[PDB]
C-alpha cells in the first residue's frame, strides 16, 4: 500500500505525521496527474482552516527531502509534483534461487525511450538480472 | 529442456537444418556450467559422431552465433569460449488496466557490469519491467 509506505518513510526520516501531511500524501497517491500546489490547496483547504498555499509548498519540500516527491519545473510555470514510487534492482541466482538487492541510479535513457515507443507515462521500474551467484560459481568452478 | 526446445525453434525459424551434430552441440551448451571451448565440445561429442572434427564444431558454433544462440568469448591468442544465450525481455506494464506491451532495447551493458561487480554474480540475462499508465488509460484519466 502506497500511503502506508509513504508514512513509514516519514516516520523513518523523523518527519511529524500531521493531519495536513497525511492529507497531502493521500491526495498525491490517489491523483493520476502531477498537481500544482494550488491544485492541492483547492482540493484540501475546506477541511483545514490553517492551510495556505505556503503550508502546501512547505510540506511538499519536506516530502521532496524525504524522497517521496519530485518537483517538476517548466518555463515560467508553477512547479508540479510527482509522487515517487521506488524502483527495484535484483540479482537472481538460477542455480540456488538466491535474490540479492542492489542499487543503480535510475534508468532514465531506457524509460524515456520506452515512453516514446509504447506511449506510456512512466512511474517506476523493476529490473531482474539472472545469473549465478558467487557461492554457486565457486562451487561449480 | 525448455531452453533446448526454444533454441531448436530458432534454428527451424531461421532455416538452419537441425542435424544430429547441431542438436548435440546445443544440448551440451545448454547443460554446461562454465563456458566451454570448442575442444571441450569436440571431446564431449566425438564418441557419438564419426564425421565430427574440430572444424565442424567451429562451423556449427558460427551458425549458432549468426542465429543469436551463442556468443563467442575471445581472449588474446588463446582459444575462445562459448556462451549459450538466453534472451533479455523488456515490458511496459499498465498499472490501471494491466496491459503489457513488449519493447526492444539494445542491452543494459553498463547496468549488468556494475551489478556483477557489486553482487558478485556472473550475469546471463535480464527482464526489465517498466510500470506506468498506457496511452489509452491516460486519455480517460485526463492525461
Ligand atoms: Zn546461487
Ligand atoms: Zn492501461
mmCIF file of C-alpha atoms and ligand atoms in Angstrom:
data_model
loop_
_atom_site.group_PDB
_atom_site.id
_atom_site.type_symbol
_atom_site.label_atom_id
_atom_site.label_comp_id
_atom_site.label_asym_id
_atom_site.label_seq_id
_atom_site.Cartn_x
_atom_site.Cartn_y
_atom_site.Cartn_z
ATOM 1 C CA UNK A 1 0.000 0.000 0.000
ATOM 2 C CA UNK A 2 1.486 3.271 -1.219
ATOM 3 C CA UNK A 3 0.208 5.620 1.508
ATOM 4 C CA UNK A 4 1.192 3.163 4.240
ATOM 5 C CA UNK A 5 4.740 3.014 2.787
ATOM 6 C CA UNK A 6 4.977 6.812 2.464
ATOM 7 C CA UNK A 7 4.001 7.207 6.128
ATOM 8 C CA UNK A 8 6.674 4.643 7.030
ATOM 9 C CA UNK A 9 9.239 6.786 5.183
ATOM 10 C CA UNK A 10 8.130 9.892 7.105
ATOM 11 C CA UNK A 11 8.390 8.078 10.438
ATOM 12 C CA UNK A 12 11.859 6.755 9.487
ATOM 13 C CA UNK A 13 13.127 10.166 8.301
ATOM 14 C CA UNK A 14 11.839 11.834 11.505
ATOM 15 C CA UNK A 15 9.013 13.889 9.916
ATOM 16 C CA UNK A 16 5.946 14.501 12.088
ATOM 17 C CA UNK A 17 2.845 12.883 10.560
ATOM 18 C CA UNK A 18 0.448 15.819 10.842
ATOM 19 C CA UNK A 19 -3.144 15.742 9.567
ATOM 20 C CA UNK A 20 -2.208 18.130 6.716
ATOM 21 C CA UNK A 21 0.763 15.984 5.687
ATOM 22 C CA UNK A 22 -1.339 12.832 5.710
ATOM 23 C CA UNK A 23 -3.972 14.540 3.564
ATOM 24 C CA UNK A 24 -1.447 15.857 1.033
ATOM 25 C CA UNK A 25 0.148 12.403 0.688
ATOM 26 C CA UNK A 26 -3.279 10.794 0.266
ATOM 27 C CA UNK A 27 -4.077 13.319 -2.474
ATOM 28 C CA UNK A 28 -0.775 12.617 -4.261
ATOM 29 C CA UNK A 29 -1.123 8.826 -4.051
ATOM 30 C CA UNK A 30 -4.667 8.916 -5.469
ATOM 31 C CA UNK A 31 -4.153 11.533 -8.230
ATOM 32 C CA UNK A 32 -3.000 10.439 -11.705
ATOM 33 C CA UNK A 33 -1.873 13.925 -12.744
ATOM 34 C CA UNK A 34 1.161 15.761 -11.332
ATOM 35 C CA UNK A 35 -0.637 18.500 -9.402
ATOM 36 C CA UNK A 36 0.449 22.036 -8.608
ATOM 37 C CA UNK A 37 0.439 23.374 -5.044
ATOM 38 C CA UNK A 38 -2.690 25.378 -5.977
ATOM 39 C CA UNK A 39 -4.417 22.107 -7.104
ATOM 40 C CA UNK A 40 -3.641 20.505 -3.765
ATOM 41 C CA UNK A 41 -4.752 23.614 -1.821
ATOM 42 C CA UNK A 42 -8.072 23.846 -3.728
ATOM 43 C CA UNK A 43 -8.788 20.151 -3.059
ATOM 44 C CA UNK A 44 -7.978 20.228 0.679
ATOM 45 C CA UNK A 45 -8.458 23.710 2.182
ATOM 46 C CA UNK A 46 -12.128 23.095 3.001
ATOM 47 C CA UNK A 47 -11.002 20.670 5.687
ATOM 48 C CA UNK A 48 -8.015 22.627 7.078
ATOM 49 C CA UNK A 49 -8.728 26.188 8.288
ATOM 50 C CA UNK A 50 -4.972 26.883 8.712
ATOM 51 C CA UNK A 51 -3.866 25.523 5.335
ATOM 52 C CA UNK A 52 -2.414 28.003 2.815
ATOM 53 C CA UNK A 53 -0.615 27.616 -0.493
ATOM 54 C CA UNK A 54 2.534 28.286 1.602
ATOM 55 C CA UNK A 55 1.754 25.462 4.007
ATOM 56 C CA UNK A 56 1.261 23.150 0.975
ATOM 57 C CA UNK A 57 4.578 24.146 -0.582
ATOM 58 C CA UNK A 58 6.352 23.800 2.807
ATOM 59 C CA UNK A 59 5.059 20.248 3.166
ATOM 60 C CA UNK A 60 5.971 19.379 -0.406
ATOM 61 C CA UNK A 61 9.525 20.482 0.331
ATOM 62 C CA UNK A 62 9.658 18.197 3.388
ATOM 63 C CA UNK A 63 8.368 15.342 1.201
ATOM 64 C CA UNK A 64 10.954 16.070 -1.507
ATOM 65 C CA UNK A 65 13.704 16.000 1.163
ATOM 66 C CA UNK A 66 12.345 12.580 2.278
ATOM 67 C CA UNK A 67 12.434 11.215 -1.307
ATOM 68 C CA UNK A 68 8.644 10.954 -1.610
ATOM 69 C CA UNK A 69 8.065 13.692 -4.139
ATOM 70 C CA UNK A 70 9.856 15.060 -7.196
ATOM 71 C CA UNK A 71 9.438 18.682 -8.248
ATOM 72 C CA UNK A 72 8.729 19.146 -11.975
ATOM 73 C CA UNK A 73 9.600 22.567 -13.417
ATOM 74 C CA UNK A 74 8.771 24.062 -16.831
ATOM 75 C CA UNK A 75 9.404 27.538 -18.232
ATOM 76 C CA UNK A 76 7.510 30.254 -16.376
ATOM 77 C CA UNK A 77 5.006 27.771 -14.974
ATOM 78 C CA UNK A 78 4.397 26.922 -11.308
ATOM 79 C CA UNK A 79 6.017 23.649 -10.270
ATOM 80 C CA UNK A 80 4.190 20.366 -10.458
ATOM 81 C CA UNK A 81 4.697 17.440 -8.085
ATOM 82 C CA UNK A 82 5.214 13.758 -8.764
ATOM 83 C CA UNK A 83 4.746 11.179 -6.018
ATOM 84 C CA UNK A 84 7.701 8.772 -6.220
ATOM 85 C CA UNK A 85 7.312 5.019 -6.358
ATOM 86 C CA UNK A 86 10.591 3.209 -5.671
ATOM 87 C CA UNK A 87 12.486 1.339 -8.388
ATOM 88 C CA UNK A 88 13.906 -2.091 -7.579
ATOM 89 C CA UNK A 89 17.024 -3.908 -8.768
ATOM 90 C CA UNK A 90 17.552 -7.597 -8.022
ATOM 91 C CA UNK A 91 20.136 -10.213 -8.959
ATOM 92 C CA UNK A 92 18.612 -13.704 -9.034
ATOM 93 C CA UNK A 93 20.617 -16.954 -8.932
ATOM 94 C CA UNK A 94 19.365 -19.513 -11.474
ATOM 95 C CA UNK A 95 21.038 -22.366 -9.533
ATOM 96 C CA UNK A 96 20.127 -21.819 -5.878
ATOM 97 C CA UNK A 97 17.353 -19.193 -6.164
ATOM 98 C CA UNK A 98 19.237 -16.583 -4.066
ATOM 99 C CA UNK A 99 17.987 -12.973 -4.600
ATOM 100 C CA UNK A 100 20.368 -10.073 -3.878
ATOM 101 C CA UNK A 101 19.158 -6.450 -3.941
ATOM 102 C CA UNK A 102 21.434 -3.772 -5.421
ATOM 103 C CA UNK A 103 21.328 -0.028 -6.120
ATOM 104 C CA UNK A 104 21.612 1.697 -9.511
ATOM 105 C CA UNK A 105 20.982 5.470 -10.093
ATOM 106 C CA UNK A 106 17.990 5.063 -12.380
ATOM 107 C CA UNK A 107 17.369 4.099 -15.999
ATOM 108 C CA UNK A 108 16.363 7.469 -17.492
ATOM 109 C CA UNK A 109 17.532 6.670 -21.070
ATOM 110 C CA UNK A 110 15.541 3.447 -21.191
ATOM 111 C CA UNK A 111 12.458 4.945 -19.528
ATOM 112 C CA UNK A 112 12.456 7.909 -21.933
ATOM 113 C CA UNK A 113 12.739 5.652 -24.974
ATOM 114 C CA UNK A 114 10.129 3.186 -23.639
ATOM 115 C CA UNK A 115 7.689 6.065 -23.014
ATOM 116 C CA UNK A 116 8.158 7.142 -26.640
ATOM 117 C CA UNK A 117 7.855 3.758 -28.330
ATOM 118 C CA UNK A 118 4.967 2.423 -26.177
ATOM 119 C CA UNK A 119 3.196 5.715 -25.446
ATOM 120 C CA UNK A 120 3.130 5.008 -21.700
ATOM 121 C CA UNK A 121 3.621 7.585 -18.969
ATOM 122 C CA UNK A 122 6.322 6.026 -16.770
ATOM 123 C CA UNK A 123 6.171 5.679 -12.963
ATOM 124 C CA UNK A 124 8.916 3.245 -11.915
ATOM 125 C CA UNK A 125 10.682 0.028 -12.875
ATOM 126 C CA UNK A 126 11.850 -3.329 -11.592
ATOM 127 C CA UNK A 127 14.998 -4.859 -13.102
ATOM 128 C CA UNK A 128 15.761 -8.536 -12.526
ATOM 129 C CA UNK A 129 19.189 -9.718 -13.548
ATOM 130 C CA UNK A 130 19.547 -13.510 -13.854
ATOM 131 C CA UNK A 131 22.775 -15.405 -13.475
ATOM 132 C CA UNK A 132 24.837 -17.368 -10.978
ATOM 133 C CA UNK A 133 25.738 -16.146 -7.502
ATOM 134 C CA UNK A 134 29.319 -16.041 -6.198
ATOM 135 C CA UNK A 135 28.805 -19.130 -3.992
ATOM 136 C CA UNK A 136 27.391 -21.261 -6.802
ATOM 137 C CA UNK A 137 30.040 -20.026 -9.223
ATOM 138 C CA UNK A 138 32.790 -21.050 -6.737
ATOM 139 C CA UNK A 139 31.119 -24.462 -6.221
ATOM 140 C CA UNK A 140 30.852 -25.118 -9.974
ATOM 141 C CA UNK A 141 34.374 -23.839 -10.800
ATOM 142 C CA UNK B 1 14.615 -28.951 -21.629
ATOM 143 C CA UNK B 2 12.614 -25.802 -22.409
ATOM 144 C CA UNK B 3 15.857 -23.937 -23.228
ATOM 145 C CA UNK B 4 16.802 -26.572 -25.827
ATOM 146 C CA UNK B 5 13.304 -26.589 -27.362
ATOM 147 C CA UNK B 6 13.445 -22.803 -27.753
ATOM 148 C CA UNK B 7 16.880 -22.988 -29.416
ATOM 149 C CA UNK B 8 15.606 -25.641 -31.855
ATOM 150 C CA UNK B 9 12.622 -23.388 -32.682
ATOM 151 C CA UNK B 10 15.068 -20.544 -33.525
ATOM 152 C CA UNK B 11 17.044 -22.840 -35.840
ATOM 153 C CA UNK B 12 13.861 -24.011 -37.559
ATOM 154 C CA UNK B 13 12.592 -20.430 -37.996
ATOM 155 C CA UNK B 14 15.877 -19.189 -39.409
ATOM 156 C CA UNK B 15 16.128 -22.069 -41.913
ATOM 157 C CA UNK B 16 19.007 -23.881 -40.230
ATOM 158 C CA UNK B 17 18.903 -27.663 -40.669
ATOM 159 C CA UNK B 18 18.535 -29.464 -37.332
ATOM 160 C CA UNK B 19 21.240 -32.097 -37.744
ATOM 161 C CA UNK B 20 22.200 -34.644 -35.024
ATOM 162 C CA UNK B 21 25.534 -32.854 -34.546
ATOM 163 C CA UNK B 22 23.822 -29.464 -34.143
ATOM 164 C CA UNK B 23 21.332 -30.863 -31.662
ATOM 165 C CA UNK B 24 24.115 -32.474 -29.621
ATOM 166 C CA UNK B 25 26.204 -29.280 -29.524
ATOM 167 C CA UNK B 26 23.186 -27.214 -28.400
ATOM 168 C CA UNK B 27 22.327 -29.799 -25.747
ATOM 169 C CA UNK B 28 25.925 -29.698 -24.495
ATOM 170 C CA UNK B 29 25.900 -25.874 -24.326
ATOM 171 C CA UNK B 30 22.555 -25.748 -22.501
ATOM 172 C CA UNK B 31 23.850 -28.244 -19.920
ATOM 173 C CA UNK B 32 27.256 -26.636 -19.406
ATOM 174 C CA UNK B 33 28.158 -24.865 -16.148
ATOM 175 C CA UNK B 34 31.150 -22.907 -17.444
ATOM 176 C CA UNK B 35 31.628 -21.599 -20.985
ATOM 177 C CA UNK B 36 33.229 -24.440 -22.919
ATOM 178 C CA UNK B 37 35.957 -24.279 -25.519
ATOM 179 C CA UNK B 38 35.497 -25.882 -28.936
ATOM 180 C CA UNK B 39 37.929 -28.599 -27.761
ATOM 181 C CA UNK B 40 35.657 -29.300 -24.761
ATOM 182 C CA UNK B 41 32.667 -29.707 -27.095
ATOM 183 C CA UNK B 42 34.627 -31.887 -29.550
ATOM 184 C CA UNK B 43 35.876 -34.253 -26.804
ATOM 185 C CA UNK B 44 32.400 -34.468 -25.224
ATOM 186 C CA UNK B 45 30.760 -35.475 -28.514
ATOM 187 C CA UNK B 46 33.436 -37.218 -30.616
ATOM 188 C CA UNK B 47 32.431 -40.625 -29.231
ATOM 189 C CA UNK B 48 28.939 -40.229 -30.706
ATOM 190 C CA UNK B 49 29.947 -38.764 -34.094
ATOM 191 C CA UNK B 50 32.437 -40.262 -36.645
ATOM 192 C CA UNK B 51 32.336 -37.359 -39.134
ATOM 193 C CA UNK B 52 32.878 -34.794 -36.388
ATOM 194 C CA UNK B 53 36.060 -32.778 -36.489
ATOM 195 C CA UNK B 54 37.089 -29.735 -34.509
ATOM 196 C CA UNK B 55 36.321 -27.833 -37.787
ATOM 197 C CA UNK B 56 32.700 -28.988 -37.816
ATOM 198 C CA UNK B 57 32.324 -27.911 -34.197
ATOM 199 C CA UNK B 58 33.604 -24.422 -35.022
ATOM 200 C CA UNK B 59 31.461 -24.252 -38.163
ATOM 201 C CA UNK B 60 28.348 -25.104 -36.148
ATOM 202 C CA UNK B 61 29.248 -22.548 -33.439
ATOM 203 C CA UNK B 62 29.453 -19.893 -36.185
ATOM 204 C CA UNK B 63 25.977 -20.907 -37.391
ATOM 205 C CA UNK B 64 24.648 -20.612 -33.831
ATOM 206 C CA UNK B 65 26.379 -17.241 -33.302
ATOM 207 C CA UNK B 66 24.733 -15.941 -36.503
ATOM 208 C CA UNK B 67 21.351 -17.240 -35.262
ATOM 209 C CA UNK B 68 21.867 -15.343 -31.931
ATOM 210 C CA UNK B 69 22.062 -18.561 -29.880
ATOM 211 C CA UNK B 70 25.719 -18.407 -28.846
ATOM 212 C CA UNK B 71 28.209 -15.715 -28.068
ATOM 213 C CA UNK B 72 31.928 -16.181 -28.504
ATOM 214 C CA UNK B 73 34.138 -15.060 -25.638
ATOM 215 C CA UNK B 74 37.564 -14.247 -27.076
ATOM 216 C CA UNK B 75 40.930 -13.914 -25.383
ATOM 217 C CA UNK B 76 44.208 -12.620 -26.877
ATOM 218 C CA UNK B 77 45.743 -15.520 -28.868
ATOM 219 C CA UNK B 78 44.011 -18.068 -26.576
ATOM 220 C CA UNK B 79 41.121 -20.376 -27.556
ATOM 221 C CA UNK B 80 37.661 -18.831 -27.426
ATOM 222 C CA UNK B 81 34.921 -19.986 -25.100
ATOM 223 C CA UNK B 82 31.225 -20.158 -25.969
ATOM 224 C CA UNK B 83 28.195 -18.972 -24.048
ATOM 225 C CA UNK B 84 24.634 -20.136 -24.761
ATOM 226 C CA UNK B 85 22.469 -17.005 -24.908
ATOM 227 C CA UNK B 86 19.235 -16.507 -23.042
ATOM 228 C CA UNK B 87 17.190 -13.595 -24.354
ATOM 229 C CA UNK B 88 16.521 -10.395 -22.424
ATOM 230 C CA UNK B 89 12.993 -9.060 -22.105
ATOM 231 C CA UNK B 90 11.604 -5.529 -21.842
ATOM 232 C CA UNK B 91 7.965 -4.904 -20.883
ATOM 233 C CA UNK B 92 5.811 -1.811 -20.188
ATOM 234 C CA UNK B 93 3.011 -2.630 -17.789
ATOM 235 C CA UNK B 94 -0.098 -0.518 -17.216
ATOM 236 C CA UNK B 95 -0.944 -0.085 -13.534
ATOM 237 C CA UNK B 96 -4.526 0.869 -14.415
ATOM 238 C CA UNK B 97 -5.709 -1.775 -16.935
ATOM 239 C CA UNK B 98 -2.965 -4.427 -16.643
ATOM 240 C CA UNK B 99 -1.916 -4.094 -20.319
ATOM 241 C CA UNK B 100 1.619 -5.371 -21.070
ATOM 242 C CA UNK B 101 3.462 -4.057 -24.138
ATOM 243 C CA UNK B 102 6.816 -5.589 -25.158
ATOM 244 C CA UNK B 103 9.525 -3.303 -26.460
ATOM 245 C CA UNK B 104 13.051 -3.575 -27.781
ATOM 246 C CA UNK B 105 16.168 -2.028 -26.241
ATOM 247 C CA UNK B 106 19.833 -2.867 -27.172
ATOM 248 C CA UNK B 107 21.003 -4.344 -23.874
ATOM 249 C CA UNK B 108 21.894 -2.914 -20.484
ATOM 250 C CA UNK B 109 25.645 -3.490 -20.512
ATOM 251 C CA UNK B 110 26.591 -0.709 -18.011
ATOM 252 C CA UNK B 111 23.995 -1.930 -15.512
ATOM 253 C CA UNK B 112 24.934 -5.627 -15.942
ATOM 254 C CA UNK B 113 28.629 -4.816 -15.486
ATOM 255 C CA UNK B 114 28.030 -2.798 -12.346
ATOM 256 C CA UNK B 115 25.579 -5.412 -10.956
ATOM 257 C CA UNK B 116 28.127 -8.187 -11.425
ATOM 258 C CA UNK B 117 30.696 -6.085 -9.548
ATOM 259 C CA UNK B 118 28.521 -5.137 -6.578
ATOM 260 C CA UNK B 119 26.729 -8.509 -6.187
ATOM 261 C CA UNK B 120 29.480 -10.945 -7.312
ATOM 262 C CA UNK B 121 27.099 -12.621 -9.805
ATOM 263 C CA UNK B 122 28.035 -13.959 -13.235
ATOM 264 C CA UNK B 123 25.309 -12.403 -15.399
ATOM 265 C CA UNK B 124 23.232 -14.291 -18.009
ATOM 266 C CA UNK B 125 20.265 -12.101 -18.946
ATOM 267 C CA UNK B 126 17.695 -9.657 -17.625
ATOM 268 C CA UNK B 127 13.982 -8.783 -17.518
ATOM 269 C CA UNK B 128 13.075 -5.108 -17.176
ATOM 270 C CA UNK B 129 9.524 -4.185 -16.230
ATOM 271 C CA UNK B 130 8.511 -0.561 -16.553
ATOM 272 C CA UNK B 131 5.336 0.399 -14.744
ATOM 273 C CA UNK B 132 3.157 3.275 -15.759
ATOM 274 C CA UNK B 133 -0.079 4.186 -17.476
ATOM 275 C CA UNK B 134 -0.830 3.304 -21.069
ATOM 276 C CA UNK B 135 -1.809 5.867 -23.714
ATOM 277 C CA UNK B 136 -5.439 4.657 -23.702
ATOM 278 C CA UNK B 137 -5.789 4.829 -19.917
ATOM 279 C CA UNK B 138 -4.108 8.253 -19.823
ATOM 280 C CA UNK B 139 -6.670 9.595 -22.328
ATOM 281 C CA UNK B 140 -9.530 8.692 -19.922
ATOM 282 C CA UNK B 141 -7.648 9.872 -16.769
ATOM 283 C CA UNK B 142 -7.144 13.404 -18.229
ATOM 284 C CA UNK B 143 -3.560 12.931 -19.497
HETATM 285 ZN ZN1 LIG C 1 23.440 -19.458 -6.170
HETATM 286 ZN ZN1 LIG C 2 -3.983 0.957 -19.422
#
